[PDB]
């Protein structure tokens, strides 16, 4: 019965071609609910889920202000990074940040995050205890030292344990019809000859939420991984997800193979076989 | 942290320039607040150069390098007041900072209502309240900002919209506790182990991230630690 809220922000410099592009998005579990894009006409936080549309103008104004406050800070952090790494104005650089919180089924705080990457590499991260930092290099060690002295971890823990949880709990209630309701996978198996003597069996899971799912193949009731393929879980575009798993088998031996599906929305795991 | 000249003297009609310097101004907006004696602070400039509705055009602002400047052109007798710059300390997570203030002498439905102030013995306790009206209370972070007699504004404490996050100045940490009853549209400040240095008018101030300023101020409640 646990839930997460996550914000994902990306700043990409383009010196001389205007201010850096800043994009932020916010998720509750696997559902996107807001975006901000510095290149959009509005220059405002915008809704990306039906249930956030309830929020009044005070919400949109204040969230807009906060996200812009972050974008200004991170533009400056891009400058600082250039100095610490001794990089020119010619390059496009990327500063990414993720923060958010995890709550248990009764709303109790489980975990917080507050972390940064520069050009695709870890820069600095708030540790599990929310009292200390991991720096990835000499540059980030300078940042770590400042933030330790300035007791920045304390302010971030205050946000993570407070506002972050408070917000998440409110969105969960307001969005309960879709946020708190599991969608079980609809399943089926397909069969494709590849020669006179081999076939591909494909086990499908469709229309499920949340994204977490496990598909496994067995042969004669024994786990089978040889000759199997698994695609990455993918968005359908309507709020649900898709995945499949496949195995190449000797034609005539299809019946020995079973696909097993585990998902939160299933009261019991599913076992599938090809049934033409 | 935010340095301002002690005073500026002008004659009616001439331009008055008030400066404020600090590293954070480089990557943060400057606000300016006017305060006439007997009256509470008023926002005159936000986001470096923007005036709130109702503020006269003769007040303007800029913020370049690490300096912010409030200019009053054609300064009038009614402009005699103390002016405070305000930004955020970018070295810190959540720390509002007011400039030292400048005394400018000229010579030839929204509502916050504070209460609870009064005389208290040294090492005593007191609880302050503020009732809010005319805006969606739980949509805004609320602060207490104090002013000792004849001194500047000092931000004391802040609380998030739904109350889960609270923030304190180093000066009051461990001794004061901010909280809110959103159903009562009321903010509180529990003050323990009071000292001489706590003697001040305590203002309730509403912050808006949209403007990045305290746009609404109450009338204050006076706390005197004596005897």
């Amino acid at each position: 019965g646990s839930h997460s809220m996550r914000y994902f922000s990306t700043s990409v410099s383009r010196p001389g071609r205007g201010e850096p592009r800043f994009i932020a998005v916010g998720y509750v579990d696997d559902t996107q609910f807001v975006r901000f894009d510095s290149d959009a006409a509005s220059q405002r936080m915008e809704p990306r889920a039906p249930w956030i549309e309830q929020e009044g103008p005070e919400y949109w104004d204040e969230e807009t202000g906060k996200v812009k406050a972050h974008s200004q800070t991170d533009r400056e952090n891009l400058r600082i990074a250039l100095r610490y790494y001794n990089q020119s104005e010619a390059g496009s650089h990327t500063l990414q940040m993720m923060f958010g919180c995890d709550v248990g089924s009764d709303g109790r705080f489980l975990r917080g995050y507050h972390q940064y990457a520069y050009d695709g590499k870890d820069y600095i991260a708030l540790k599990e205890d929310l009292r200390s930092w991991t720096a990835a290099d000499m540059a980030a060690q300078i940042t770590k030292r400042k933030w330790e002295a300035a007791h920045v971890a304390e302010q971030q823990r205050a946000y993570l344990e407070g506002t972050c949880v408070d917000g998440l709990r409110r969105y969960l209630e307001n969005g309960k019809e879709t946020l708190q309701r599991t969608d079980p996978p609809k399943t089926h198996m397909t069969h494709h000859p590849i020669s006179d003597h081999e076939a591909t069996l494909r086990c499908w899971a469709l229309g499920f939420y949340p994204a977490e799912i496990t598909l496994t193949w067995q042969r004669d009731g024994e786990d089978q991984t040889q000759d199997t393929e698994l695609v990455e879980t993918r968005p359908a575009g309507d709020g649900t997800f898709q995945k499949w798993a496949a195995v190449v088998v000797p034609s005539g031996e299809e019946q020995r193979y079973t696909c097993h599906v585990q998902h939160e929305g299933l009261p019991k795991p599913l076992t599938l076989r090809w049934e033409p | 942290v935010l340095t301002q000249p002690p005073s500026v003297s002008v004659s009616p009609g001439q331009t008055a320039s008030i400066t404020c310097s600090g590293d954070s101004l480089g990557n943060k907006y400057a606000c300016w607040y006017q305060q006439k004696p007997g009256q509470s602070p008023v926002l005159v400039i936000y986001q470096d150069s923007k005036r709130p509705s109702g503020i006269p055009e003769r007040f303007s602002g800029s913020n370049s390098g690490n300096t912010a400047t409030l200019t009053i052109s054609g300064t009038q007798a009614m402009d005699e007041a103390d002016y405070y710059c305000q930004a955020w300390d970018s070295s810190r997570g959540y720390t509002v900072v007011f400039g030292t203030g400048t005394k400018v002498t000229v010579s030839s439905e929204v509502q916050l209502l504070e209460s609870g102030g009064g005389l208290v013995q040294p090492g005593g306790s007191l609880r302050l309240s503020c009732a809010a009206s005319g805006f969606t209370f739980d949509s805004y972070a609320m602060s207490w900002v104090r002013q000792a007699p004849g001194k500047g504004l000092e931000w004391v404490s802040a609380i998030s919209g739904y109350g889960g996050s609270t923030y304190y100045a180093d000066s009051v940490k461990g001794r004061f506790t901010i909280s809110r009853d959103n159903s009562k549209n009321t903010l509180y400040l529990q003050m323990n182990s009071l000292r001489a240095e706590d003697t001040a008018v305590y203002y309730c101030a509403k912050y808006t991230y949209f403007l990045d300023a305290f746009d609404i101020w109450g009338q204050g409640t006076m706390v005197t630690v004596s005897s």
Binding site: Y7, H70, A81, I142, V152 | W88
Partner: peptide, 9 residues
Amino acid sequence: QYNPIRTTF
């Protein structure tokens, strides 16, 4: 609810 990040590197 967003975190109004203020802190520089």
